[model samples]
Target: ATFTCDELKGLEHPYEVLGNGDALAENREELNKLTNDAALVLASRLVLECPVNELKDFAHAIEAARMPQDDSDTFHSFLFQAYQVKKRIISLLDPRNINPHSMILEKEFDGELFNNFNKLAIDVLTNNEVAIALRLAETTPAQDRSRVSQNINNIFPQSLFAAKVGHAFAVRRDIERLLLGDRPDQFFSSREFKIDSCIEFASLFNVINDKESSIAGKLALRTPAENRTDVVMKIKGFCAEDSELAIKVQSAFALRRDIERNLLGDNPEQFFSSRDFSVDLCLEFAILFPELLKGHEQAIGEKLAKLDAKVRSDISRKLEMINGAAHE
Candidate 1:
């Protein structure tokens, strides 16, 4: 569903080692002359080397290098650019229009449906013109929804309006944050990637909200692997068809796997105790596995337990508060 933190950190290809060609020197005409692969490579390099402020000006040239078959490499290039500039640029290219369904759904491309997950964050981070235009489009005298739709489609490609891309958009937003310096678990844990919010009918089953405390992600962690097909079937049935709810459900599963892979290595207790871990990570771990909370709570408490009287009481007070809630 999303790139691992290691994956984001490892994409450190510097311009010094790449061929002496200047990534910024290439105009659209020069970009068009290169092979699709070369253009993609140049665009990726430009993202790392380009001036942060001028990155928006190069969008047209980036479009010039759009590949016929955009896989993860193309998405990664855009992802890195968004990260470097601390902006949302993944919506610039809609690979869903060009790639096969399998490619779009698979981890190689991992394209999401670009729904609430990304739309909210992208809107917040993006400049005002698009949002302002959207509001104006909505107020059109014709009362025509298509104008509003078109304005949205212009900002976020039409392909992103569907369910598959929405899942990707959620992860893409998370990856953008991960690149911007948020710990992976800080945002991932204790959050629900709601797939069934649109199901309005009373007869249908909405599996996401059935869990206690709205922590629907617990389903992904607790369900046996052999029964995942049944879970997918339930999600699909809830949507009344293969409405890609399964994709969203599977994204939750993918996130669970990633959290386990990234945070809980061989010795989780030792990992929590070491100075290498951050408070956000500890908080996330506690949220995910409250049964195992004792070790982490103790780990955090030990460090803060000896501080000034006020800090220690504040720590004790918060710990008591959490204990009371868990008891509830």
Candidate 2:
């Protein structure tokens, strides 16, 4: 399928070597023009075949690309521009008495739906069961409500907050699975299972929790620091255990290390926080395992082009799978 500029924003083109800086600049300009043309073609097809729903999906993809954790202000700015283009197209297509209030409601609903879908994915990862997690997620009410009694003169109950907490935990679990392993199911199923509080959720999942005492008290009796270190060590050790996974992980670490040492003030955390940096890191990892990837190696050259192609295709395929399943 063709992709619009918005959809293509996250895509990295195969690198081409140029003789000098001027030549490289010229090549980049030409490539940009070509990509724009491609995007227009893709947008036209989308408009023709599936306008409204496709546009909604595109908007969701853009929002996903601009996630807070992505830390790409430049890309987000580009997305805003693309949003303007999409808005104009929508207005032109459905201008006849389109209620302004309806647009607002649609936007609100879209945001909530996307959030819930994300949470559902997390819950699935956390619970590690499609049937149970899906059932719970499907029952979650979309609206948020607060109760206050005249006699109490204070907010007594917050509807959906607990559910939200559960959702967040599930998301954390998903991330841990992605970065660490497939053991979240095992962890949650154990008798010692305890979900972290909202504030501690990120750290706990990221293996950076500070509540050493609580974690140490478990049957797995180790301080949070120890646990975190153990996880980190395990990640490092994976390079030796699983050669393929190790190559990717090592390539990622090496690229991050290089960026930090040279351009990023030697701060790995800052790079992780930046969306562009994360993409670059991922692309670099892809490059490291060219033999295992399927792409035009000649076009990608010495850069991480192979890895980028593989990851981009993988993500697209996953999204397609979701779309197919959703429709079915």
Candidate 3:
């Protein structure tokens, strides 16, 4: 016959599992599992079937039922209470899990039920050591998780809360005051404050304040070319319409168009003479192709022979300057 929960009632005592006693009654392990399951069932029932206000009376009933077994009510009553309020390990994270592993209610009430319980058991336990405790709780046959969770809690408790939240909240609160800038209560007598880090400052402004376009435009200017592509692509029309940003965007677009004229199509001597070509553009092109106009600069006086000597007399002298500029 499957052992029901009654045979397992009243077994809890801190360090009780390791107590000297006759080996457990043959059905003890199965009864422990049954009691575990029963507590959850009744707790769920208590929540839904009855009004929330009536639970204290119900909790007392669960407590009395397990603490002392009235022979007549020994079977299910004692079993359910074993894992209900005082008899379990628990967490604030989940007020449930009211098994031998967690009795959050008791911990909150007196702050004493799980003294040995450690942070080793975390809010979500599968990723924590409680999974090991749970392995012993459910799936493993012929095992005891009570003592395992006992030592586990000593090293790693279930109900305790630990987070990086300390001092961080205050840090952010003070920083926010500074980031807000020149607030009212100026109290005029107080010392002033300052800050920097353009990107970070702009980021904080973006999140905490409005879209602050001037700061954003400032950030864009100092960013790299590939990165600036996004600023050019996204920010437009007015925010950047006036300042250096306007000039940058204009240059950004202007250079892209010029790259097309330089890299493609036909051009005659007149193209150089036209308003379209400039000293800057010629310099840019000459650096790209030093010998494009002439076959090659033989360098010695042969380079001058290629030019019409009458018009080119001054040309050879300028080549030295142009060559210096190109190389520079």
Candidate 4:
């Protein structure tokens, strides 16, 4: 099921990969195919022509497997591609797309086994995701549930996303459970303190300020299990576009435009792509929003990739000085 881009180049034109291509539409098509093919390979291994109805346990099968961010290396092209493709593949495994009965033949399989597995897929699987969304929603009392569901779903995907009703559902207490702390060694690790649950958690939790939770976290998770910086980048890579996140980024873009106006008092560069940004700026500001701001992730990544990397260090340094003074 694992295939190299080289291995399946022509076979995947219909799948959409983000590799080299001439047209915008064509490039996006390529990236999408690459991600889908990789995920199909991943999911096919678990739920092939075999009996999906008979498989009893899927907790680990669905959510417990490792994430690409766990072992990805940005320096290596092939490795990162694998990491990204696999990451997206898993996210697409939302319950709606899956069926416990022969996904190949929905009602064809045995009923009890079929129903139970589907129940876990539909209820338990998504419940795990929604519980966090619910907790995030609790912080917003005035908001409608429908709107909250849409936004939270934006932040939480295997890292892929779109609006589907299964996304919004929360219990208020669990928000406290995460902020306060939880015992990870015990069986219910899902209920324990998890940092990635919401953007607020990703942005706010002081992993070190309080020793009890810190100690508990240390006990529950590896001391440096995953880098916090990378975690934010990965989650943000999804472009958390619910109404609130959208507004935060939208305003940030507005601020960026103002900053540009000052910097562009006299248009020194004739073109916008004459390199108007930096990776540092991209990471630290609303610039991250352009591709992530709207459309699906694969499309955004491929589209923006056309721009060259920051001119080694010089261009970014110049922009840094200008932006820093402007920020003042």
Candidate 5:
């Protein structure tokens, strides 16, 4: 009465079990399990039969299906149409039998039927919130490890805290690999490279809340005598016990002061314009990290608010047109 796909055994009458939904309502448990077996077989057959390019399209369609709102609706509708094409495929499948190895080798089994069913299967699985979340957890970059852990939680929702903490430990094992990777300055040879790197490293040390005294002394010693200004030295003894941490803090503040001195000393536009940042690159960044896009949009509005009224209005008008194009 029941079947398992891995074993490929039992479930003598899958067609009857699936078709008998209302009639078999009394024995819903077995009926539900049998339906899954049939689904697995159908999915496997579809996978075997689909063309490569059609399979690629199916993957792209699933990605679109997983997005929020109107985009999902459009792709879902496309998938529904594709399902009708797949119904044509099912009409040709030997529904009465349950042989996992059975192929649709019959003369009636046409090429196009499978492309439809293959695409449909992908849509069905990807449309489920749990399934999509699990897929995202597996495939998406865990740049913000906690967010990725939450995604993985959707798959194994139980023990949520453990899942998050476990991933952190897993990443901990790869510390050496991450450490040995290229320094940020190696990729950028400009005069401001060292300035930027120094600011970043010192900022990281300064931000850590656990202010141990030994670490404070370490930070103080790390600050070069040539680089140490009166302000940094004054702060070093201000929190005497945590001298190293204070030094790191003052180091960051010093770098920021000098960076402004160098950057705003002359033509701001000339400095920015010479860099590699471009409209296309900015767009690429936004598209890749969509949540950051929202953040940047808010920042853009803040910057726009400070601009000359006429310039602000002109930029807003152009952005409105671009937003309209995006909506379409």
Candidate 6:
């Protein structure tokens, strides 16, 4: 004589199954199965909702579900496959006349341009790790210690430093352009800035930074005063709500110098030339940027350690089988 409500007031599409008191114990296994199935369905929906080019969040969700025992192998294998899927999506979506790579790098410009730049940065980091790991594995085995170090230097050469420097210079140019451009009086006069205006300005900032396309194309759509007001509102709003964004931008500027000095500066040839090109080194660098790599290492390490243990265990099992055959 017990019953459960099927619908809640606000949550129209509830993921959980509700059952009557009489059926509770009887449906325990079925209920648990339903819960698990619902979780998977939700996870898949979350992935689909994410932008085709932005695979990091989806990859993370899948990674979280991976079990250390039987699921680690499947999880790692799926990540590479998903990366390929995301890469294809980016290629298809990118506009013509844009170097998809450069377009991605431009995405780092803050404002409305967050989505594209964020996705591209994730892609670069992900692919770089894969490429660097593969190269190290292939070249390090037979080489002398000195040669191994030299190979590392060759892989991450001074050219990378030059590339980053050039990239930073380009960023600075865009910021200067925005600051010096004709600003509207409303921008300085507005008492409170709206998030929508901030988002729009962010997009404009991104276009200026990433795309070489002329702003003249968009000028007809809005008056110079409107544009300036929008930009000012965005800057003021971002400063108030996301003050950290300023810090991040500043850090990016500082990082350019740091990378030049330490990663790719005068003795860069000496820096990468060592046994320092391991996964641990990658994790260490990530940890150094606590704001970025927060919780990333433990997540990666736990999965990797689990995978290593499984491979070792499998090898030991195979070895035991060979010994048994010999004894027989």
- Best candidate per lDDT, number? 1
Candidate 4 global CA lDDT score: 0.33
Q: Write the residue-wise lDDT of candidate 1 on 118-213 in tens digits.
A: 433343334433322322222232333333334345445644242223333333343234312223223223254343322322121232223322
TM-score of 2: 0.18
Candidate 6 lDDT at 195 equals 48
Candidate number that wins on TM-score, 2 or 4: 2
Ranking by TM-score: 3, 1, 2, 4, 5, 6
Worst 10 residues of 6 by lDDT: 212-221
- Backbone clashes in candidate 3 total 11
| Clash totals for all candidate models | 9, 2, 11, 11, 3, 4
Candidate 6 residue runs with Cα over 4 Å from true position: 1-44, 52-54, 70-87, 94-328
**Tens-digit lDDT track of model 5 for 1-328:** 3334322224344323322223223333332333433544543443334443354455453344333442412323343344344443333222443421122222233344434354443443332433222222233343544554443344333543334333333322222122122221121222322322233222222323453332323323243445445434434433353455554445444333332443234432322234532333222222122322334555456644666687667655644443443322
Model 4: worst 10 consecutive residues (lDDT sum): 99-108
lDDT of 6 by residue, 1-328 (tens): 1222211212233212221223333332332333333433322233334454446544554445344542423322323343444444345233442333332233322332223233433444342433322222222222242343343233334434223323333323333444324322233234543344344224324424422111221221122434544543455564544443333333333333343354443333222333433333222223123333244434433433534576546533533343343222
Q: What TM-score does model 1 achieve against the real structure?
A: 0.22
TM-score of each: 0.22, 0.18, 0.23, 0.18, 0.17, 0.17
lDDT over C-alpha atoms for residue 20 of model 2: 23
Shift of residue 328 alpha carbon in model 1, Å: 6.6
Q: What lDDT does candidate 2 reach at residue 298?
A: 34
Candidate 1 lDDT for residue 126: 47
| Candidate 5 weakest ten by summed lDDT | 179-188
Query: Could you list the CA RMSD of all candidates, in the order they appear?
Result: 21.9, 29.2, 21.0, 25.9, 23.1, 29.7
